[PDB]
Symmetry: C3
Subunit: 679 residues, 3 copies
């Protein structure tokens, strides 16, 4: 009926920040003020210890935990929970100097020097052992500290190491996966360019001066790295769990992060967390950007089948590392933070409570500016959001009931982006997926963002833009899902290769060819100056009309059972099917042969939602840039109405919600209103 | 009267592909189907063995030739010839592992790891010896196999190596060229920035962290690489010639390839072959691309004085490695293939017969798609092309009779591009030469593309765009050619330096100053937003009018006997001469002082062609984007009408011609389709 | 009343060039012709020996001075002085070969090979000793040669070395400055990302594969390189002085050069010299570029409190290293050269007297072209400038009397440009400072360009654009300056950090918050597509109107005593103060909260000039693109009228002046040609 909260100790939404009091121990007045202001702002959680290695172990084997004892006791005394971090995000300088193997070797084989962060070798037995020791200390000292509600494992795991140890490890991994060199060579088609591996010691990680044209290799390298960090993360976790199995562990994920398959890494965590820094107010409007963000929130919720996630980081204002450091306009901080909550966040947390005074993130936004207090515009909006969050306790643990699934698949992505062709100028996978998402999000229809391994049975509608790789089982599951009454939508450049990037030989859409009822003979590629158009067939079942712009990729297809919903208007393939639907069992499978404009997706998916009677957050038309999200505890529903436009927008309510809101609602620019009601 | 065919066994044009069966030995069904479709596509040649080294020598010393025996037998049983390749294009991984000396060191001094292709050390004694062994095996086993018609030496030679051994060779090379450090220091002007070399061990190839501002060094490093590869190629050929001196050998060249002077590497080959992947349909139109490709075709022919060449590689559809993988539009494959033939190819071949299933060229085009048959759009057009090429047997061996020559010179290009000034933002040498070429190509007037060392004496017209380097003899030959009644055209930034990039001191156009009858005082450099104009003087002999746009470079010249054909419209040199003609002996030498638009070139060269009465492929006006190319056996002519436009184009024939392909006489009014080509034949 | 000339031997302005006769020893006729042409162009100075190391010591220990003895004797016999150079800008090849420690190791830790220039390790004991010997030779031989008037130390010092010696040197530098690691860790806030240094050996120069996010370290790395080069240049100077303490020494500086704090380096020189290559005629107009160049001239003069400087290098035409090699238009060479003189140059010199024949600078401009004479447009204009300069003898040693100072501070720039935010897309510091300058330059108001350490007392008006870093003393001096009746102007992003890039905690703008009477709460960052507007408050003291356009950066401020002169017209801070003034003692301090357009600066600064009654070169309205500069010897004033428009421009004189160059009295209405310059003189 409702998910358990992050801890039995908490009873609503969390509000908080990364906290680095270790930078300020020379000013105890700052530490006392920090806490007074936390409570003023209604922050009830902080993440502590993240970059504290040198503050915990300034010399090898010599520890100094006192400041942390103090910090944890003070937060506890003041009713503030802690996510305690393991400090593996940044080794001390002494450790680098004494054990250089903890440093990485780059893809270009350049050895790193000490510095930066998140740049440890993941094979290094020394570093893994020091992590065990450090984590063992933190656990035996703090796993029963009443403040502590969970573990923040490392920080923002990322990157790759090509040192000789990592090469050895990679060779072993390959040898476990394919059992003979025979299997490997076949899987990679290595006879091409006489790349035949005749001994295991010949295998090597990719490099610009060596080999980076063997797709199978590049792909498995990414899988291998995923397994490296997943094992690294498990090992970090275990000494912690040994002292207290009841404390949950997470690690903080990044925006559409490419290095690791988060579906794999997620299987080692108790709950999901991520870090979101959208470049608000940098484009024509914030609508697209909002939908892109919202889709990733959904992904984060989907990784544990609806279980709420933590927004571990975000800025209250601007960042320090983007081309511009734009201020969030008044209201937008509430709106962006509530958007996380709207799609399943049970905590809104920020990077930095208090701005660092020196170093590279001193101009990153925080709750407490350099001016030393929170009587600033930023501070006041943070505090105001604190109030709002504390007033949303019933939303904590509530579920998102999505009947729509969109596939975003890391392995497909990796093999697609690595491939040479069919548009080396850019495929824009993230963006394309999101373009599909946007037409649903515009209607306030809930979406889960699964990968191709997830079970399709609970859904009415499954959408797979550019599912380039169709692994074993996937086409069968899809086919079964449609047959049983499901509806499927796939696009151009789906069903092309298998697990190791070998093309199918049965004609393209491959394992999906029978369900889609079409053959994709060839794909045309378009420059950024070129276009085609798609126009609906009179009487077509979705009422598509247009014409709509088609850009970048246009496939030439042949009907094999499917009927044409729309045709191309231009080029040598003019008059040919552009959009099709196929009847398969009691379901229907749609195919979209070209990359089309926003209007196309809006027409296509609003028709398809009307026909399928998909549930919406509110049953009323939403103006452009206004969206709606719904969470429920089984007893009430909570509707998040959001206005990403930069002017006022008015919505008509189809029923009564809670006192009681008027029948007709003006949302301010960047406004948000939460409507509640019994089901 | 007519060149020899590639083999005594063949009787017409060849049609084929690179073929890689060794990737498919686990599916014998595929190998059978391969050959069936090959015949059904009218493919009569395959290149075999190019990347087969690990398929031939999986361990050091141990060979496995059975599969190749089978392929060659099967192709021969089915009436398909073979260009058998030496596999030095890609060494096996064991070889890299055991003998790392085979790997290169980059210009940035980064050593390469195993992988990629075409990236072997050209000094390495071990690699050269391993290649000798392999090539000896191949020759001894197959040099008399009835399938084999020729040798495909390596694959797309290219790149450079800076390992200590190559540095050693480079020092020896330099010392044999200049005898003393005195001559070298003077040649390169090394006193500048105190770069005087006082010992041969101080000489080093260019590097970004070392020396790359000494122009003479950069130039000779390129010359040195050229000779390294020419020697490498000779050594490869010899054990093959040793088993059978009658088999020809080629190596496949690249599009306007910059690394090596192809005029030197061609001297070791029997015939010329190249690989062409123009980005069709990616621009406003395909006209300029078409002429650019045509010009290179002419160069490939010219390299051996009119001898037909092989189009060793092309795509039937798209490539895998460009920004876009555009499909050839219906008809364009036919047209781009027949273009190669029109300008002297006696073979049309494709990169890949069958798509690789995996690895980096899996989405490169081929005859046989992953779908496993050739009843596809690409397939059907390849097959149709195969029909047309079998119908064009009489064209094989025919000649291209060009009375115009254009100079494209690798050494001049190298020194000109390496220079600091006069426009670092871009000189666009290949593009500039081709801009000249296009005004002739648009008229159906044949052109050879010679370098500055070729003999000028058979030509009526010689054109030299940006002949920056004028080596010893060139100025003299040019002058003689004009004096004897020839016509010569040179542009801005010609006659600037000598063999080692030393500027002439006698005023610029240097050695060409007398014949041109002008002094080029100074060259002005213009941003991409800045322009000038050129306008005809009233009564000028070429009938030049305009105004025409001038961009990028504008020279300030002084008449010294020459007359002004046109003047500048704008800037502080407005009213000054911009185009000139000079009478010298019985001939005329023209100079164009600024980089002018396509319209300028058209007026200039159509006027000049009319006046000179240059022969055309057809004596009728050709619409824009329609071209005509002529080949001849001395008895008949074969006219290739080509429409590069994306719509229909209708032309009138001023004579009666036969349809060599479909039979009968063509009508007088002839509509070429979009991307169309039609072949007219007629007795002289 | 007037500064001393560079030497007791000279009596007016110098006119000359870098001269490299050592490239031409095989053609004595050239060396004779050189000197004849040098006098014909009225060139009275040459810089000699700059890249002559291998011409002076072709083997280790073994010298060859005879060609130089010759050269110096011949120049002296022909009334031409010499800045003799020390040749440390380019080591010989043998020295690199035998002592590899003289080569640099790059920021990326890649070790350099021999080649290039200005790329010596500055810690290298061998290279410093070799420089000691070589300089000691030159000095003992030539310190009393009658031709020699100064020392040209090295050539354009630049770059950095990261070899293990320089790392050691750096650790000793940091230890001598911080004393303990405690202090260092605190200054750099190194507890951030666990960067706490626990041993001096852990410290390392920045790198891309190591550490380059610690600002404290990046900033101190640049201070350390400044000290390294300052010491290196001292050490070069001392043997020269030891032989003749009367000979002045300079080193030639570069355009807004970033690697070194020139205020530190200048302390070691007797006089200032620099090298100017503006890209004239490459933009919409040359006005902005001209103001930008003028500002640097003023900076060069300000380095020694008004002491005239040497324009050591410039081109007579084009360069070889820019995207385009544009020709200076007719008149522009005169104007660009006289601009240097108008802002305090007592010498106008060019890179290269005679074009090198062979290396990378062979297409860099020079007085003598490859054509071998100076009867060329370029030569003629050089000669004509020669005349003009000789006619301006009285200007030599004259002063610039500026009551306005702009702050250009290296340390502030470093720390600001290294910061992450508030606009990584670009802060454009040089351009922003110059935007302020232009509004004054446009009025012909003189400006000294100081750093934040200079004494402010002599000025009426001090302008600090983006004074990001406010070091100890600066805020107090500024506040004192205002309090005493001074007027201060500051912008957005001033008063943010201290000496080690630690943020202030009182509220921005930190130490200037009292004097400015505002609090800057936050700064907003705008994409290149976005703008806001600034509009004057009715009855504001400066008569600001607008709206003006604001870009890139806009701060939200709060008034704390100051009054608003303007407000924003857009975004969420619309209606908020955008421009403010504060009364503080007898002065007024202005704050400009956003980066505004040209028209704002014009309105702001013309109103502020009229109100303050600042002195103009001429008391007349100047057309757009027409500027005026004033020098004085205490008796007369020399006014340089300058037209950077490409068309005629007419100006009304408010008094009567003599034409010092051409003679007689000028009228009250005067029309300057395109790129025209007229020099007006008059008694005070
Ligand atoms: Zn590693």
């Amino acid at each position: 009926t409702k998910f358990p909260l992050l801890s039995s100790k908490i009873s609503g939404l969390l509000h908080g920040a990364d906290y680095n009091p270790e930078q300020w121990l020379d000013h105890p007045d700052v530490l006392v003020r920090d806490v007074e202001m936390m409570k003023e702002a209604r922050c009830n959680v902080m993440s502590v210890g993240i970059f504290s290695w040198s503050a915990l172990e300034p010399e090898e084997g010599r520890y100094t935990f006192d400041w942390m004892d103090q910090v944890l006791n003070r937060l506890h005394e003041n009713g503030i929970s802690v996510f305690l971090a393991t400090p593996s995000g940044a080794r001390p300088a002494w450790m680098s100097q004494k054990y250089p193997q903890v440093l990485r070797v780059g893809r270009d084989r350049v050895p790193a020097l000490h510095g930066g962060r998140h740049n440890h070798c993941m094979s290094s037995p020394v570093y893994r052992e020091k992590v065990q020791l450090m984590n063992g200390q933190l656990a035996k000292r703090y796993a029963h500290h009443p403040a502590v509600i969970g573990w923040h494992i490392s920080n923002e795991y990322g990157g790759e190491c090509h040192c000789d140890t990592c090469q050895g490890q990679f060779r072993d991994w390959l040898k476990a996966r394919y059992v003979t060199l025979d299997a490997l060579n076949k899987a990679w088609w290595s006879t091409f360019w006489s790349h035949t591996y005749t001994d295991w010691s010949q295998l090597e990680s990719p490099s610009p001066q060596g080999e980076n044209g063997v797709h199978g290799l590049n792909l498995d390298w990414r899988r291998f790295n995923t397994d490296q960090v997943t094992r690294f993360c498990s090992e970090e976790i275990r000494p912690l769990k040994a002292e207290n199995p009841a404390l949950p562990a997470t690690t903080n994920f990044m925006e559409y992060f490419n290095d690791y398959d988060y579906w794999k890494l997620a299987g080692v965590l108790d709950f999901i967390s991520w870090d979101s820094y959208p470049m608000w107010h940098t484009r024509q409007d914030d609508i697209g950007l909002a939908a892109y963000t919202a889709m990733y929130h959904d992904l984060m919720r989907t990784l544990k089948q609806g279980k709420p996630f933590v927004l571990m980081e975000s800025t209250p204002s601007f960042t320090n590392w983007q081309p511009t450091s734009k201020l969030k306009k008044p209201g937008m901080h509430i709106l962006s933070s509530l958007q996380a909550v709207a799609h399943g966040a049970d905590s809104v947390q920020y990077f930095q409570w208090r701005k660092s005074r020196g170093s590279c993130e001193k101009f990153h936004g925080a709750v407490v500016d350099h001016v030393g207090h929170i009587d600033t515009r930023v501070g006041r909006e943070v505090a105001e959001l604190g109030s709002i969050l504390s007033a949303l306790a019933p939303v904590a643990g509530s579920r998102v009931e999505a009947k729509v699934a969109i596939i975003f698949d890391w392995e497909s992505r990796w093999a697609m982006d690595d491939a040479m062709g069919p548009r080396n100028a850019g495929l824009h996978y993230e963006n394309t997926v999101a373009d599909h998402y946007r037409a649903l999000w515009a209607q306030g229809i809930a979406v889960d963002v699964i990968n191709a391994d997830c079970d399709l049975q609970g859904y009415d509608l499954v959408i797979a833009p550019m599912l380039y790789m169709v692994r074993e089982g996937v086409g069968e599951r899809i086919s079964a899902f449609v047959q049983a009454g499901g509806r499927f939508v796939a696009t151009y450049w789906s069903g092309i290769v298998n697990e190791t990037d070998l093309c199918f030989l049965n004609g393209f859409p491959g394992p999906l060819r029978p369900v889609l009822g079409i053959w994709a003979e060839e794909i045309d590629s378009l420059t950024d100056e070129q276009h085609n158009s798609v126009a609906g067939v009179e009487g077509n079942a979705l009422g598509l009309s247009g014409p709509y712009r088609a850009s970048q990729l246009c496939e030439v297809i042949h009907l094999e059972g499917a009927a044409a919903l729309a045709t191309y208007g231009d080029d040598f393939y003019a008059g040919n099917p552009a959009v099709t639907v196929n009847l398969y069992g009691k379901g229907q499978a749609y195919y979209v042969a070209s990359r089309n404009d926003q209007q196309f997706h809006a027409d296509f998916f609003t028709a398809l939602a009307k026909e399928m009677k998909l549930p919406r957050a509110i049953n009323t038309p939403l103006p452009e840039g206004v969206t709606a999200a719904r969470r429920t505890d089984g007893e009430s529903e909570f509707i998040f109405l959001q206005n990403y436009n930069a002017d006022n927008q008015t919505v008509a309510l189809p029923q009564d919600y809670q006192g009681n809101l008027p029948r007709k609602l003006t949302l301010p620019a960047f406004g948000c209103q939460i409507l509640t009601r019994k089901i």
